[PDB]
Amino acid sequence: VSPVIATLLLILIAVAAAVLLYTWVSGLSANVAGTQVTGKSLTLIQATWAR
Amino acid sequence: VSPVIATLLLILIAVAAAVLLYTWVSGLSANVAGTQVTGKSLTLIQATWAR
């Protein structure tokens, strides 16, 4: 009755690993920060200097 | 359990190559020299000659 018991334990193992892959994949996603785009250059109201 | 292990190694591979594309693209940019525009023609103060 060896084959019958062997097959059962193998089925359970592969199911558990697949579900674990899902959690890891989805957690991996939506895990990217990125950047902001600086606005257009600031208009120059004045440039001057003093002592 | 073949599919489960196969998929994992494939995910990692594609992620690594994408990040490498980014470094190469950004390094490629801002890598253009260009030119200067020579000023307006120089005014002629004098034209002359001697022996």
Looking at B1-51, list the stretches that DSSP marks H as alpha helix, in order from N- to C-terminal side: 2-28
Give the span between the Cα atoms of A23 and A25, in whole angstroms: 6
CB-facing half-sphere around the CA of B5: CA atoms within 13 A: 4
Which tokens in the block code for residue A26?
A: 């989805």
Question: Determination technique for this PDB entry?
Answer: cryo-EM
Spatial contact of B1 and A14, defined as CB atoms under 8 Å apart: yes
Q: Taking phi first (over 0 means left), then psi (-120 to 50 degrees means alpha), and beta for anything else, what does residue A40 get?
A: beta
Amino acid at the residue B6: A
Give the span between the Cα atoms of A45 and B2, in whole angstroms: 67
Among partner residues A10, A17, A28, which is closest to B4 by beta-carbon distance?
Answer: A17
Neighbours of B38 (CB within 10 A): 7
Among partner residues A17, A25, A28, which is closest to B1 by beta-carbon distance?
Answer: A17
